[PDB]
Each structure stands twice: as C-alpha cells, then as structure tokens.
Amino acid sequence: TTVRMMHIETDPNVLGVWEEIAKDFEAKNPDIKVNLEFLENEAFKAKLPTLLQSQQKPDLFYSWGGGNFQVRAESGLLEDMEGYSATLNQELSAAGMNAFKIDGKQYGAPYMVSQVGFWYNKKLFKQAGIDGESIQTWDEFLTAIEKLKAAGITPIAVGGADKWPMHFYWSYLAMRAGGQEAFAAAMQDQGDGFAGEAFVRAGEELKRLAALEPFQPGFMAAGYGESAGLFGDYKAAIHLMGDWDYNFQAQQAVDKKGVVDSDLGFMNFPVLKGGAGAGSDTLGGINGFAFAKGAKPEAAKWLEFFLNENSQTKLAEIDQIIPVAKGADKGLKNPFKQKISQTISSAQWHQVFFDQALGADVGGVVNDISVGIVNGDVTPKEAAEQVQEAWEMRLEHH
Numbered sequence: 001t002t003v004r005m006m007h008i009e010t011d012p013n014v015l016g017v018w019e020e021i022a023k024d025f026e027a028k029n030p031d032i033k034v035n036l037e038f039l040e041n042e043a044f045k046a047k048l049p050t051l052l053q054s055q056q057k058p059d060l061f062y063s064w065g066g067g068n069f070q071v072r073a074e075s076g077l078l079e080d081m082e083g084y085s086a087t088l089n090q091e092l093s094a095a096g097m098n099a100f101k102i103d104g105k106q107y108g109a110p111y112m113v114s115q116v117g118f119w120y121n122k123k124l125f126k127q128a129g130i131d132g133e134s135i136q137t138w139d140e141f142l143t144a145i146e147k148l149k150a151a152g153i154t155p156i157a158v159g160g161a162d163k164w165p166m167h168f169y170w171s172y173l174a175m176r177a178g179g180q181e182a183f184a185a186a187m188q189d190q191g192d193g194f195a196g197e198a199f200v201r202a203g204e205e206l207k208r209l210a211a212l213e214p215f216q217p218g219f220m221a222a223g224y225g226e227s228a229g230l231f232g233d234y235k236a237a238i239h240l241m242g243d244w245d246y247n248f249q250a251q252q253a254v255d256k257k258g259v260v261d262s263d264l265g266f267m268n269f270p271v272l273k274g275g276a277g278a279g280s281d282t283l284g285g286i287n288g289f290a291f292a293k294g295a296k297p298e299a300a301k302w303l304e305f306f307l308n309e310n311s312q313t314k315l316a317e318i319d320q321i322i323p324v325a326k327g328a329d330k331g332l333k334n335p336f337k338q339k340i341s342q343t344i345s346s347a348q349w350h351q352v353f354f355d356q357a358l359g360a361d362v363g364g365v366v367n368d369i370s371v372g373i374v375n376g377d378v379t380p381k382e383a384a385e386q387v388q389e390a391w392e393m394r395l396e397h398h
C-alpha cells in the first residue's frame with residue numbers, strides 16, 4: 001500500500017531526515033510505501049479547499065489545527081483514526097493529541113509546538129548601541145527601533161506580501177494589551193468582542209511602529225523567504241518569527257550560514273504599558289498532520305513511526321522542532337531551542353496563531369488589516385470592527 005503525506009517543508013536537512021525515517025520505516029514494513037508530497041505554504045493553504053473535495057486526496061496533510069481544522073472535522077472532510085491511535089497516544093503528549101481530537105474522534109496527530117518571538121542580530125545591535133537583553137517593554141522596543149534607524153540599519157525584516165508575518169505584530173500586541181481574558185471574550189463575541197479596546201490598542205501600537213518606517217524597502221512585495229534571507233544576510237536587525245526561523249534564515253542566507261550563534265539573539269515579545277497580558281504568554285501553536293477522509297490505516301502506521309521518540313529526537317537535534325513525542329525533549333541541546341522550549345512549557349497562555357485560530361475567512365481579515373494598518377489604509381478602530389464583524393457572521397453561519 002502507498003501512503004501519501006502532503007507537506008510544506010523546504011529545508012534540505014529536515015527533508016533528508018524525513019527521508020531517512022521513511023527509508024527505515026519501509027525496511028521494517030515492506031508492505032507499505034511512503035510518498036512525501038511538497039506544496040509551498042501559501043500555495044498549500046490556497047489549494048487545500050479544492051483538494052479536500054477531490055476524489056484523489058493524500059492520506060495526510062499538514063495542519064495548524066485551529067478554525068479550519070474544526071470546520072473540516074465537523075463537515076466530514078477528515079477521517080476518524082481513533083481505532084488506530086493507541087500507539088500514537090502512548091508516544092505523544094496528550095495535549096498534542098487533544099489538539100487534533102474533536103468529539104472523541106482522532107482526526108490527526110501533533111508534530112511540533114512553536115513560539116513566535118524576536119530573532120535579532122547582536123552585531124547590528126552593538127553598532128546601533130542597543131543591549132538586546134534590556135528590552136522588556138514595547139516602549140523600549142520602539143526606542144531600539146529608533147536607534148537602529150538613526151544608525152542607518154534596516155530595523156526589521158517582514159514578509160509583507162504573505163501578510164501573516166505582519167499579523168504576528170498585531171496579534172501579540174492584542175495579547176499584551178488585553179490578556180487571555182479579552183481574547184476569550186472576543187471568541188465568544190461577548191461585549192465588544194474583537195472590536196474591543198485591546199484590539200484597537202493593538203492597531204494603535206502597530207501604527208506607532210509603522211510610523212518609524214522600520215521595515216525593509218519593498219516589504220509589501222517581499223515574501224517570507226526573501227525577508228528571512230535579508231535577516232540571514234545581516235541586512236536587517238530584527239525578525240519576528242516562529243522558532244523554525246533558526247534554520248530558515250541560514251538556508252535563505254547567501255552564505256548558507258546566516259546569523260551565526262555568537263551574533264544571534266532571541267527575545268520574547270515585550271510587555272505593554274497599561275496592558276493586561278503577561279510577558280510569558282506565547283504566540284505559537286501545535287502543528288501536526290490531519291487525516292483526509294478516506295485515509296488508509298497504513299497512514300496511521302506511518303505516522304506512529306514518523307512521530308516516535310527517535311524520529312522526533314533527530315528533528316530536535318537538527319534544531320528544527322520543539323517536539324511533541326515524550327522523551328524527545330532530550331534532543332533540545334541547542335541553547336536557543338532549550339530556552340524557547342522552557343518558555344512554551346511555562347506559559348499560562350499559549351495562543352495559536354490568530355489567522356489559524358480564526359479560520360481562513362476571519363483569519364484572512366486579520367492578515368489583511370495587519371498590513372492595512374501599516375500602510376495607512378485602515379484605522380485601528382476600523383480594522384478591529386472588521387474582525388469582529390466577520391467573526392460574528394462566521395458564528396452565525398455555522
């Protein structure tokens with residue numbers, strides 16, 4: 001039998017490890033072949049809707065959980081693999097398995113957890129006269145931005161063309177302004193919801209950052225790959241990105257090394273004055289693979305092995321993922337990844353990426369108003385009302 005797994009992975013080292021695991025699995029299981037199918041992130045997300053309606057579908061596809069996963073599970077687009085999940089449940093974290101379980105039905109399995117934060121270049125910070133470790137508040141972050149501006153260094157790389165990198169700013173600002181309580185009320189559409197003060201404040205503070213002109217020339221035409229390459233090429237000082245950026249900025253750098261460890265820093269998103277959120281709250285998520293309707297049981301056998309402790313330990317040791325398999329945290333030797341993994345574990349609020357939490361429609365609105373605020377197209381108040389209004393209609397029509 002042949003199992004097909006659709007993914008968005010571009011890293012050659014990661015893919016080599018995945019192929020090694022596949023080869024090992026195939027030796028232990030001669031009856032089963034594993035075929036990996038790549039689709040680039042933006043194209044993948046765009047095509048999945050029609051793919052899930054087709055008659056030829058992969059067994060497994062990359063998933064962020066969140067809003068689209070829920071709708072797909074309830075709408076009959078995924079396959080319940082609860083009867084083939086005993087070993088997955090033994091090997092993987094229960095919180096990770098629960099993220100892909102709806103109504104007692106197991107529709108996927110976790111692969112990794114992540115944190116979004118500020119990767120930064122200590123060599124460029126020294127040139128501008130900034131101590132990165134002293135940045136604890138948003139006002140201190142803006143002061144650092146102005147010092148980079150005055151030094152003639154591009155402060156921030158962002159892939160504005162893809163929009164979601166910019167949304168990380170609006171999202172974190174809303175988390176810091178309103179805390180978990182505000183987001184929970186907004187999801188329930190209680191009170192003013194997403195049009196509430198926390199979300200307007202997020203827009204106001206994003207507008208304040210944008211007025212400093214901190215992004216690279218042409219950031220609205222730049223995708224994630226170009227933006228990470230600018231960081232890796234020492235041409236931008238700061239990159240707000242998930243922890244997967246550690247290997248990506250190196251792969252996208254001309255020299256294939258990027259910002260080396262002695263020049264590299266990572267810092268949490270700062271706190272906001274007059275904000276209800278805690279500095280230890282993380283934006284990130286639990287990514288995994290979902291089972292499309294019609295998936296064969298052999299796909300669960302593959303996933304059992306692909307996500308086991310040895311496989312996940314390898315992927316942590318090449319500094320790619322923060323693992324979900326029990327015991328694979330032994331592979332978090334790299335100091336950047338070890339510290340990030342501890343932040344994720346200690347977080348009282350760990351929030352899934354807003355665009356994935358809210359689904360393709362409302363999440364697309366959040367992505368649009370993030371770049372819209374920065375470009376002056378929409379005010380912070382108008383942008384928050386757009387999110388609330390789209391969310392209210394999603395609630396009504398489901």
Ligand SMILES: O[C@@H]1[C@@H](O)[C@H](O[C@@H]2[C@@H](O)[C@H](O)OC[C@H]2O)OC[C@H]1O
Pocket residue numbers: 008041164224242244287353354355356
């Ligand atoms: O919608 C965003 C996703 O597209 C993005 O996906 C990243 C992917 O770019 C990277 O290569 O692997 C991690 C994966 O999560 O995540 C953030 C979302 O906001």
